[PDB]
From Swiss-Prot, chain A:
Official protein name in the record: U3 small nucleolar RNA-associated protein 7
Assembly information from the UniProt record: Interacts with snoRNA U3. Interacts with MPP10. Component of the ribosomal small subunit (SSU) processome composed of at least 40 protein subunits and snoRNA U3.
Subcellular location: Nucleus, Nucleolus
Described function: Involved in nucleolar processing of pre-18S ribosomal RNA.
Species of provenance: Saccharomyces cerevisiae (strain ATCC 204508 / S288c) (Baker's yeast)
Additional note from the record: Present with 5800 molecules/cell in log phase SD medium.
Residues of the full protein shown: 278 to 388 of 554
Renumbered ranges of WD repeats: 1-34, 37-74
Residues of the signal peptide: none
Swiss-Prot record, chain B:
Role played: Involved in nucleolar processing of pre-18S ribosomal RNA and ribosome assembly.
Main subcellular localisation: nucleus
Compartment(s): Nucleus, Nucleolus
InterPro entries in UniProt: Quinoprotein_ADH-like_sf (IPR011047), SSU_processome_Utp21 (IPR007319), WD40/YVTN_repeat-like_dom_sf (IPR015943), WD40_repeat_CS (IPR019775), WD40_repeat_dom_sf (IPR036322), WD40_rpt (IPR001680)
GO cellular component entries: 90S preribosome; nucleolus; nucleoplasm; nucleus; Pwp2p-containing subcomplex of 90S preribosome; small-subunit processome
Keywords: Acetylation, Nucleus, Phosphoprotein, Repeat, Ribonucleoprotein, Ribosome biogenesis, rRNA processing, WD repeat
Domain notes from UniProt: The WD repeats are grouped into two tandem seven-bladed beta-propeller regions.
Family annotation (SUPFAM superfamilies): Quinoprotein alcohol dehydrogenase-like, WD40 repeat-like
Other noteworthy facts: Present with 2020 molecules/cell in log phase SD medium.
Ranges: WD repeats: 22-53, 63-93, 101-140, 150-183, 190-227, 234-269, 277-329, 336-370, 397-436, 445-479, 487-523, 528-563, 565-606, 608-646
Protein name: U3 small nucleolar RNA-associated protein 21
Subunit structure: Interacts with snoRNA U3. Interacts with MPP10. Interacts (via WD repeats) with UTP18. Component of the ribosomal small subunit (SSU) processome composed of at least 40 protein subunits and snoRNA U3.
BP terms from Gene Ontology: maturation of SSU-rRNA; rRNA processing
Swiss-Prot record, chain C:
UniProt repeat feature WD, residue ranges: 11-51, 52-92, 93-131, 143-182, 188-222, 236-275, 278-318, 321-360, 363-402, 406-448, 449-488, 491-530, 553-592, 654-692
Protein name, entry field: Periodic tryptophan protein 2
UniProt signal peptide: none
Keywords linked to the UniProt accession: Nucleus, Phosphoprotein, Repeat, Ribonucleoprotein, Ribosome biogenesis, rRNA processing, WD repeat
Misc. comment: Present with 16700 molecules/cell in log phase SD medium.
PROSITE patterns the UniProt entry points to: WD_REPEATS_1 (PS00678), WD_REPEATS_2 (PS50082), WD_REPEATS_REGION (PS50294)
Native source organism of the sequence: Saccharomyces cerevisiae (strain ATCC 204508 / S288c)
Gene Ontology MF terms: mRNA binding
Gene that this polypeptide is encoded by: PWP2
PANTHER family: PERIODIC TRYPTOPHAN PROTEIN 2 HOMOLOG, WD40 REPEAT PROTEIN
Residues modified to Phosphoserine: 629, 642
Function: Required for bud-site selection and cell separation. Also involved in nucleolar processing of pre-18S ribosomal RNA.
Compartments it resides in: Nucleus, Nucleolus
Pfam families to which the protein is assigned, alphabetical: ANAPC4_WD40, Utp12, WD40
Swiss-Prot record, chain D:
Gene3D superfamilies reported in the protein's UniProt record: K Homology domain, type 1
Protein name: Pre-rRNA-processing protein PNO1
Its job: Required for small ribosomal subunit (SSU) synthesis. Has a role in the processing of early nucleolar and late cytoplasmic pre-RNA species. Recruits DIM1 to nucleolar pre-RNAs. Indirectly required for cleavage at the A2 site of the 20S pre-rRNA, forming 18S rRNA, and at A1 and A2 sites of other pre-rRNAs.
Pfam families in the record: KH_KRR1_1st, KH_PNO1_2nd
Gene: PNO1
GO molecular function, one term: rRNA primary transcript binding
Length: 111, 873, 834, 199
């Protein structure tokens, strides 16, 4: 469905219709993470200059911080089971109640 | 009281009867629940669009309404119903004869207050149950404890406390334990309203002498007092949009807004609702919004909105006054006249004693609108004469509408009470027209009619003159003077040729509108009160003074039917669209349906309230009636539109105590055969003969031009290998010996058994029955499969079977067809062995019968020869 | 008299949506644009419902009991209909694009595919009275991520299979207790899942995708789960699956591809039974009979409908309709059949009762503009813009002659001699009228005198003069037959658009551009009447119009008019949304008929919703073709300026509601109007109206029956007519014994003679009492043969109906009888040996 | 089973095939076809029908017996016996499997002498007329009527549905009795179509 690449050209995030999001290493072409089951297919993905990973699933918009890393603990998670520090829960979320998100774009030099 | 032709559908024009409405929230959205007599309606707060109505009418009028998320609680008599989406989910029946008064729901507790100062508590059986069902306990407040209960309120953050508010003072009950936690100090003035504030522990109390008290329940002391001398509080509500505003509604119809922080009055909205109907019965701020929804007993629901301040700073000081946002409404008093605006059942025109004319929509309530009374500037240029203070036009006694020229010029005429002219209106613009029609004889207008072309308007005066105006230019054209008393009816046929009139003198005038001549005059026994003309059938009925309806044919000017049975004055009546029924309402509280073809009362109803008006939809699907009480219009559905209705006369004596089948259902089924000697075709499609004769050629046409491609590896028995239905001749199973060509016993077809059985019994009636039933492919297959080898028994039997059929003279076209197929398939066999005695005798007997059926040819030839000659020369 | 109701729609058998067979399999329900048409194939009868959506129908279903029909348009607007009573029970707006609706095989529930949600509702009871909210929701399911393509019910009404554009198929349980039984999602398809079905045992689930793959799903060990045990592929080169249906009992899979060819497969083996092609256009819908024997396919582009009996490889039904093409219509002289001329260049003969095309003729290259029968009826003539007039022989269906001008003139109007010996055509570019001899085919002469294009022509049946009109603001009466050639011009205030000739031949009416119908006396050449029609006409605002409908003068006139055969009424239509029926002697509008209520047509609404208007303009005018998923839909083949004469893709503008032709039925009180959607036929057949004639108090249905019991048959019959009740006339008619028919027939009053003859003609055609009806006709003609002659035009339709009964059904019976007599004599008499 | 699952007459006619036991005798000319085809005959009988199967070499006959502890269908013995006879009469094995699989397939058996007492060359011509050159006439009858015919000298065995073999029987008899070839072929065209039609 969507492809996003970071500024450094080192990481790539891809979403598929199989409800899966995969983070890639496009210098060495090694898959880093595979979030196999998403609640719904992700329509868009974007990566900011700081490295925030943004995902949109219909009306939902979810952000993760430090997802683009080789470490296993950095894998995106939606919820920490019992407050496990290693699990990388979403950095921010927002719900557009009745709207389906069309596309995502980070404003270049603004938060 | 149950009709066999009509059933209630709903009530139009009602928004609220005055019971305080209930506001519920689903998510971000809001909805309002209003009471309409014995039913409630749910509106969408954002659009005021009707969403749901209660599925059934309650036995008694609803006294209270409370809504929480999807569920709505409606209290009536001693029972509390729980509704979801307008459908009852559970009915709570209290064990005392006292009627419920107030209703409070917090948490899993449902609190119902009866008129005897008894509070019943119900609780959820399960913590996750949607609504409370189980009866928990009963708390009764005695006169020493406090006065009559004014309302039940629950304050937030209170565990299992119910704040009972009485006229004397406020009481705090613990529902879980059923004990009085606290009693407030007595108040000098009678409390009338209570409302929990958005602040903690504080409830706003409104007294009978214009005092609003911010009572603090925790401290048990007064916090503030607003004074509104010479006013009675009916509603209270706080603003939750971050501005400390308080709205006070009064029985005088005024809504005051205070600023609690500033101790000042923001504004007052004067006469938003009529005092005579209870003023402002309910006024509630929408949670977290600047919108306030107001209601009253005048059948109206309004919304007002606070605009943002116009000052960039000090916005709290510069407060914009509230602005009207949207509203819905209807008549404040029962409608006096109703009519159908169009051929479809979309719109209705209604007029009421409140001096307003409304256009009501059956299809959607939001489309209902009030017809404007703003006047058009006079064409002459002089100033129109009227009082500067604007008032509504008087009550409308009569109305007449046409749609032949809608959008071109005025298409409605109305007659007013004690007024010497008729006003015109325009349906397309929804505004009063620019013409006014005067009687010109110093008499009041009693009758209005319009021609079907929409070019003429007829006005009947109380002094007996009929004036005729043109609707486009409003110029008087003709004036007829025959009646000496009031003209109570005028009508003109569809062709605009013959005009009819009736009056209180009892004469019926027949005029020629084209030539302006008096065709005839008919005098009836009693004064005539009303007229309805049916243009398709040229019949009109007259409601006479002697409690009769007299149906007259305009073409021949003679009474054709006269209807008796009403015990009092006939208020209204109407023709069914097909011209076959008359439904009339009378002052004896009965609606009777009369069948003109037989001239008898086929149905009767007993209405609680006398029906003033009766009107059929031009489609015939709906019947509209208005009653002496109630601001709405009762819509009934015509069950005759989905099933036949018996025209057997209704029992008169039985009806008073409450206060040939083919002819009865207006149908006739043709006989199978009128007479044995008469030739009769088969009862079926006439193409069956042609299909049987030409089966092959029809089928060669049917085949596709190119052969379908198919797989080489195909099951040989695919057609038989079907998981299980097919009833074809192929799918026949044998029913339970030496070999026989036709069929060995136990393995022969059904058809061959019947043929052999018939030959022995000397009767092929059973076989002829199955031949007629056989499909064309099956018939050809059986005849082709007949035994064609000596001694030729089956062919002889088949000829004998067909010969017997021809004797019956029924289904003869098929027996001729079967014989033709026999010659087609076995003609060579018959030709080769024509000398055989068995075949010859069977053939000869067939000829003797077949020779008789040549009379049909003689009839057929004669009719063409004469019919061709008659039509040509 | 003027009580006409919409009866059926000819010319179109399928427009879009899904066609459903009846449970009995004996009726086919086909959406025809804005309405639903029901064809009874065994009885050879058809009818179209009167109710009407505001947009085209998208999905329909009929419950197994056959009592309730639900139809849904493209906006989600639904109408529930009582099938037996043909009345509307309720209107429901589902506020979304409902792709499919299906009744449960029990009938208690029906399901809806509305976007990505599956809605299950409770079926209202047909016996119950109408109420405000008849439907009761049962559940809403939201598991799919994109729109649901279709849904399927299990045979036990316990499970539902839904297929979506998510490349997925999903199963639901109707009962919440059984949710664990079926909560599975089926993945693995590359394209949209077009259909998912259960096997008869319900242990095998088949899914089909648009790419052309069929997956077999089974509950098996790898502990048990649904798995794809087998995968089959349609190796269609580029065609994509367009529709699929499965019959569990016969294990038949019918798949329709976008290339226009369909295949029948046997599952789970995947054996190809048959492969056929209905054309080059996609197969939009496919349906199966309950028995599994008949397969119905429909193609939207050409409006084809096809029922295929795959067992015998025969066509039960094979029809193609017209949209926006019919230019003209003509009734057969007996009224049995109606012919149409279309812009395709094809002439089609339609059976009124059946609703199907009997024959098609494709000789003409260009649009056929007019068609007309000879007085005899055996022969037909048609003119076309290709420059030719062609004569057709219906006995042998040969174009036995073709007439052509010397200078290559397009012909727009036509007229035929009542003797059938001279044919005249007019044109919009020549200003002359060409005349040919039918026997020779030679151009007899070219009539001149018009200063403008000839708009219309008509021969008078008796005096045989020719009346022509033109945009020259004049009418000319030509006495072509006779030793002397005379022309009588009559001036008119404005351009003449249509012309009709009285059956008497003594007057001619013309519709002008001012919106007037003026009647002239031919012999005296003076006006005798005038009808003003501009106010009556309903003209709607087009979406592209920048001016109001009131100020619009696009079509406030009538382009076609026809008389009733009695001579007392005119039916008129034009490029507008009204068919107006006027009464000539009184010059009044008897009734007006709205042609269409379809917002898909352009001229329907006088006022347009201001919400659609924006700063850009109307939202409707924005072209959303690029949204369409298939390349064929996106392609734009429109020529920049075309108005007519091409396929709908060429125009780029919405179809506009208009009536091209109108005529009265020669044999019945009905008229047919060629319009954009099809041939609307309005008839008075129902006759629920109570229209008594000369009643008195003593006349009653009870008194009528009493008269029969007393054997006063003449008094009983006359009293029945005065009531004018069909059931009472029928009851009296069949109770009169044969011996006393001639006595009654001689004594019937002359006033009621037209009524009895009308009843016989309608009754006899479909009745079984052939001999009884012929006896009555013989008695009536013999007794009152002279009276019918003196008034030919009062009895014309009644007489024609009687002749139809005597010729079309009575003759066919004796013809089959008489050949048996001769076949008999030959077999017995001759010598059969060796 | 899936979670969505729903909650002794002899077919052969003209010959008497009849803890229960059935015995069928195999003629010598079917011994070798039985041997090379036996590997496909016992599986369906012992697995699907749950019968006990055996051939007796001493009597050259095949024995079927119902096993009450395993057999469940009361009719299985008769269906298995009717299967075995069809192979015995001369039908191909896959043609014989249809009897086990279907429940409405019946074998019609009769002799030429039953139709007419033909002898010498008259009998031989009758068998020729039924068979035709290269078996064309027999091929046509089987295809039109959707049946399977085995023409063993003067003995004819017709397998198919009831109405189907009823039509094949008439066609064969007309060929025996000498009806013109054209009338038979034309009738074969009609019965072919008329059988497959719904109406």
């Amino acid at each position: 469905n969507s492809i996003a690449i970071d500024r450094s050209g080192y990481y790539m995030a891809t979403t598929g219709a199989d409800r899966s999001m995969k983070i890639w290493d496009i210098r060495n072409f090694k898959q880093l993470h595979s979030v196999e089951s998403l609640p719904t297919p992700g329509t868009n993905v974007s990566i900011s200059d700081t490295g925030l990973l943004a995902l949109s699933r219909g009306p939902h918009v979810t952000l993760w911080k430090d997802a683009l890393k080789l470490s296993g603990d950095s894998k995106p998670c939606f919820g920490s089971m019992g407050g496990n520090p290693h699990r990388n829960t979403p950095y921010m979320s927002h719900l557009f109640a009745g709207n389906k998100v069309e596309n995502l774009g980070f404003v270049p030099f603004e938060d | 009281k149950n009709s066999k032709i009509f059933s209630p559908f709903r009530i139009i024009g009602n928004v609220s009867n005055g019971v305080p409405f209930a506001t519920g929230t689903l998510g971000s959205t809001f909805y309002i629940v209003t009471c309409v007599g014995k039913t409630f309606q749910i509106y969408d707060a954002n659009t005021l669009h009707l969403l749901f109505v209660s599925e059934k009418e309650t036995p008694s009028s609803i006294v209270a309404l409370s809504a929480h998320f999807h569920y709505v609680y409606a209290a009536y008599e001693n029972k509390v119903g729980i509704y979801k989406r307008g459908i009852e989910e559970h009915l709570l029946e209290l064990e005392t004869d006292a009627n419920v008064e107030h209703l409070c729901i917090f948490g899993d507790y449902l609190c119902a207050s009866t008129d005897d100062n008894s509070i019943f508590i119900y609780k959820k059986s399960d913590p996750q149950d949607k609504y409370p069902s189980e009866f928990y306990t009963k708390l009764t407040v005695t006169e020493i404890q406090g006065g009559e209960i004014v309302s039940l309120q629950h304050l937030a953050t209170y565990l299992n406390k119910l704040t009972v508010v009485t006229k004397s003072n406020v009481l705090l009950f613990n529902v879980r334990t059923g004990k009085l936690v606290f009693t407030s100090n007595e108040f000098p003035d009678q409390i009338t309203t209570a409302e929990p504030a958005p602040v903690l522990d504080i409830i706003a109390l409104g007294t009978v002498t214009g005092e609003v008290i911010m009572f603090n329940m925790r401290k048990g002391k007064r916090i503030r007092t607003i004074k509104i001398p010479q006013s009675r509080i009916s509603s209270l509500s706080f603003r939750t949009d971050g501005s400390s505003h308080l709205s006070v509604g009064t029985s005088s119809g005024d809504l005051i807004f205070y600023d609690l922080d500033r101790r000042s009055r923001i504004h007052v909205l004067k006469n938003i609702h009529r005092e005579s109907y209870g003023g402002v019965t309910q006024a509630t701020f929408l949670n977290g919004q600047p919108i306030i929804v107001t209601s009253g007993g005048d059948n109206s629901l309004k919304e007002y909105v606070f605009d943002p301040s116009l000052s960039q700073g000090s916005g709290d000081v510069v407060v914009q006054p509230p602005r009207y946002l949207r509203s819905r409404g209807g008549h404040s008093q029962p409608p006096s006249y109703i009519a159908f605006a169009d051929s479809q059942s979309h719109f209705m025109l209604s007029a009421s004693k409140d001096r307003s004319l409304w256009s009501f929509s059956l299809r959607k309530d939001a489309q209902s609108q009030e017809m404007s009374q703003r006047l058009h500037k006079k064409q002459d240029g002089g100033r129109v004469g009227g009082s500067t203070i604007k008032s509504k036009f008087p009550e409308i006694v009569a109305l007449a509408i046409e749609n032949a020229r809608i959008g071109e010029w005025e298409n409605i005429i109305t007659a007013h009470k004690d007024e010497k002219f008729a006003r015109t209106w325009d349906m397309r613009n929804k505004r009063v027209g620019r013409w006014t029609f005067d009687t010109t004889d110093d008499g009041f207008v009693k009758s209005v009619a319009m021609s079907q072309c929409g070019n003429f308007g007829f006005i009947g005066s109380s002094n007996g003159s009929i004036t005729i105006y043109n609707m486009q230019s409003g110029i008087l054209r003709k004036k007829y003077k025959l009646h000496k008393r009031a003209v109570t009816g005028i009508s003109l046929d569809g062709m605009n040729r013959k005009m009819v009139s009736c009056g209180l003198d009892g004469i019926v005038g027949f005029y020629d509108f084209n030539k302006s001549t008096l065709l005839g005059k008919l005098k009836l026994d009693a004064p005539i009160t009303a007229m309805v003309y049916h243009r398709s059938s040229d019949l009109f009925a007259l409601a006479l003074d002697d409690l009769s309806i007299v149906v007259i044919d305009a073409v021949t000017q003679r009474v054709v039917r006269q209807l008796w049975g009403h015990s009092n004055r006939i208020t209204a009546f109407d023709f069914s669209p097909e011209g076959r029924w008359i439904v009339s309402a009378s002052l004896d509280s009965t609606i009777r349906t009369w069948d003109l073809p037989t001239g008898g009362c086929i149905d009767g109803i007993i209405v609680d309230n006398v029906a003033t008006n009766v009107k059929f939809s031009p489609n015939g699907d709906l019947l509209a009636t208005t009653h002496v009480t109630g601001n709405g219009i009762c819509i009934w559905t015509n069950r005759a539109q989905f099933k036949t209705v018996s025209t057997r006369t209704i029992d008169e004596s039985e009806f008073a105590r409450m206060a040939l089948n083919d002819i009865d259902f207006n149908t006739y089924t043709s006989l199978e055969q009128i007479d044995k000697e008469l030739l009769t075709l088969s009862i079926g499609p006439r193409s069956k003969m042609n299909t049987l004769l030409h089966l092959d050629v029809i089928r060669k046409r049917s085949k596709p031009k190119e052969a379908p491609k198919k797989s080489e590896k195909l099951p040989f028995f695919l057609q038989l290998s079907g998981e299980k239905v097919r009833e074809g001749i192929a799918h026949e199973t044998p029913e339970e010996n030496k070999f026989k060509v036709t069929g060995r016993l136990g393995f022969e077809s059904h058809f061959t058994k019947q043929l052999r059985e018939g030959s022995q019994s000397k009767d092929y009636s059973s076989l002829l029955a199955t031949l007629i039933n056989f499909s064309p492919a099956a018939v050809d297959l059986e005849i082709r499969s007949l035994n064609s080898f000596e001694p030729f028994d089956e062919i002889v039997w088949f000829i004998d079977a067909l010969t017997q059929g021809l004797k019956s003279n029924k289904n003869f076209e098929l027996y001729e067809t079967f014989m033709s197929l026999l010659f087609k398939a076995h003609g060579d066999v018959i030709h080769a062995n024509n000398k055989n005695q068995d075949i010859a005798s069977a053939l000869q007997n067939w000829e003797d019968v077949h020779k008789k059926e040549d009379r049909l040819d003689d009839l057929v030839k004669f009719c063409m020869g004469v019919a061709a000659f008659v039509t040509t020369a | 008299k003027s009580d006409f109701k919409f009866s059926n729609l000819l010319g179109t058998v399928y427009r879009q949506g899904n066609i459903t067979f009846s449970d009995d399999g004996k009726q086919l329900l086909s959406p025809v644009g804005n309405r639903v048409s029901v064809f009874d194939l065994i009885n050879n009868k058809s009818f179209t419902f009167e109710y009407e959506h505001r947009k085209n129908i998208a999905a329909i279903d009929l419950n197994k009991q056959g009592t309730l029909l639900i139809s849904i348009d493209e906006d989600g607007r639904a109408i529930l209909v009582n099938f037996k009573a043909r009345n509307v029970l309720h209107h429901f707006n589902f506020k979304e694009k409902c792709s499919a609706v299906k009744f449960s095989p029990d009938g208690r529930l029906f399901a809806l595919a509305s976007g990505r949600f599956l809605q299950i509702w409770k079926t209202p009871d047909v016996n119950k009275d109408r109420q405000f909210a008849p439907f009761v929701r049962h559940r809403v399911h939201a598991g799919h991520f994109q729109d649901i393509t279709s849904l399927t019910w299990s045979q036990d009404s316990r499970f539902i299979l839904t297929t979506s554009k998510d490349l997925s198929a999903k199963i639901w349980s109707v009962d919440s207790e059984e949710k664990n039984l079926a909560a599975t999602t089926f993945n693995g398809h590359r394209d949209y899942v077009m259909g998912a079905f259960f096997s008869h045992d319900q242990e095998k689930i088949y899914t089909v995708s648009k790419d052309g793959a069929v997956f077999v799903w089974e509950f098996t060990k790898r502990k048990y789960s649904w798995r794809i045990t087998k995968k089959h592929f349609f190796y269609a080169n580029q065609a994509k699956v367009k529709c699929v249906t499965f019959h569990p009992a016969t294990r038949l899979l019918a798949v329709g591809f976008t290339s226009g060819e369909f295949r029948l497969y046997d599952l789970p083996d995947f054996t190809l039974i048959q492969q056929l092609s209905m054309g080059q256009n996609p197969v939009n819908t496919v349906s199966v009979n309950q028995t599994g024997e008949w397969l119905a396919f429909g193609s939207s582009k050409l409006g084809q409908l096809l029922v295929y009996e795959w067992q015998s490889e025969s066509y039960i039904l094979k029809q193609q309709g017209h949209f926006d093409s019919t230019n003209s219509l003509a009734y057969s002289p007996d009224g049995s059949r109606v012919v149409t001329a279309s812009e395709d260049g094809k002439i089609k003969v339609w059976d009124i009762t059946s609703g199907f095309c009997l024959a098609t003729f494709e000789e003409h290259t260009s649009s056929v503009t007019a068609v007309q029968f000879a007085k005899r009826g055996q022969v037909m003539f048609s003119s076309s813009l290709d420059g030719t007039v062609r004569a057709w022989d219906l006995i042998r269906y040969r174009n036995f002659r073709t007439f052509t001008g010397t200078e290559r003139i397009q012909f727009n109007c036509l007229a035929v001699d009542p003797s059938g010996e001279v044919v005249c055509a007019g044109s919009l570019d020549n200003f002359d009228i060409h005349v040919w001899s039918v026997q020779t085919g030679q151009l007899l002469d070219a009539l001149s005198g018009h200063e403008g294009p000839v708009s219309c022509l008509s021969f008078s049946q008796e005096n045989s003069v020719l009346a022509s009109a033109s945009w020259d603001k004049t009418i000319r009466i030509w006495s072509i037959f006779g030793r002397s050639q005379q022309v009588e011009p009559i001036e008119v205030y404005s351009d003449v658009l249509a012309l009709s000739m009285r059956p008497d031949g003594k007057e001619v009416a013309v519709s002008t551009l001012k919106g007037q119908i003026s009647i002239f006396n031919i012999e005296d050449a003076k006006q005798v009447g005038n009808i003003d029609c501009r106010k009556d006409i309903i003209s709607g605002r087009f979406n592209q119009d920048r001016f109001t409908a009131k100020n619009s003068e696009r079509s406030k006139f009538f382009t076609t008019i026809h008389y009733s055969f009695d001579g007392m009424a005119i039916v008129a239509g034009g490029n507008n949304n009204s068919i107006c029926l006027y009464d000539v002697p009184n010059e009044v509008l008897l009734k007006r008929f709205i042609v269409s209520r379809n917002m898909a047509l352009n001229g329907t609404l006088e006022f347009l919703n201001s919400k659609k208007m924006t700063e850009a303009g109307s939202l409707d005018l924005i072209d959303d073709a690029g949204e369409n998923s298939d390349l064929e839909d996106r392609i734009d083949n429109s020529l920049p300026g075309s108005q007519r004469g091409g396929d709908l893709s060429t125009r780029k503008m919405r179809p506009e509601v208009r009536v091209t032709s109108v005529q009265f039925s020669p044999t019945a009180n009905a008229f047919a109007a060629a319009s954009t959607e099809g041939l609307l036929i309005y008839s008075t057949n129902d006759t629920i109206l109570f229209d008594p004639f000369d009643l008195d108090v003593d006349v009653t249905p009870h008194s009528t029956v009493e008269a029969l019991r007393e054997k006063q048959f003449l008094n009983a019959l006359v009293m029945a007519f005065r009531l004018n009740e069909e059931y009472l006339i029928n009851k009296v008619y069949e109770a009169i014994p044969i011996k006393e028919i001639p006595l009654v027939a001689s004594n019937i009053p002359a006033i009621y003679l037209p009524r009895i003859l009308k009843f016989i003609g309608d009754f006899a055609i479909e009745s079984q009492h052939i001999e009884f009806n012929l006896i009555w006709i013989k008695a009536l003609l013999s007794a009152s043969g002279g009276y019918i002659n003196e008034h030919k035009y009062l009895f014309s339709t009644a007489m024609r109906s009687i002749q139809r009964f005597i010729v079309r059904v009575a003759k066919e019976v004796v013809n089959t009888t008489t050949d048996n007599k001769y076949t008999y004599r030959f077999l017995v008499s001759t010598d059969g040996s060796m | 089973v899936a979670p969505t699952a729903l909650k002794g007459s002899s077919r052969i006619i003209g010959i008497n095939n009849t803890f229960e036991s059935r015995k069928i005798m195999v003629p010598p000319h079917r011994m070798t076809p039985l041997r090379n085809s036996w590997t496909k005959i016992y599986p369906p009988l012992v697995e699907h029908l749950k019968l006990q199967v055996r051939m007796n070499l001493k009597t050259k006959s095949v024995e079927l017996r119902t096993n009450p502890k395993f057999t469940t269908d009361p009719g299985a013995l008769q269906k298995g016996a009717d299967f075995i006879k069809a192979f015995t009469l001369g039908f191909d094995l896959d043609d014989s499997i249809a009897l086990l699989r279907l429940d409405d397939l019946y074998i019609e058996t009769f002799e030429v002498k039953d139709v007419k007492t033909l002898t010498g060359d008259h009998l031989s011509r009758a068998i020729g007329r039924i068979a035709g050159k290269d078996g064309k006439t027999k091929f046509a009858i089987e295809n039109a009527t959707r049946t399977r015919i085995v023409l063993a000298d003067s003995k004819i065995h017709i397998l198919g549905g009831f109405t189907h073999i009823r039509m094949a029987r008439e066609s064969v008899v007309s060929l025996i009795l000498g009806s013109p070839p054209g009338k038979v072929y034309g009738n074969l065209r009609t019965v072919a179509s008329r059988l497959k039609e719904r109406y």
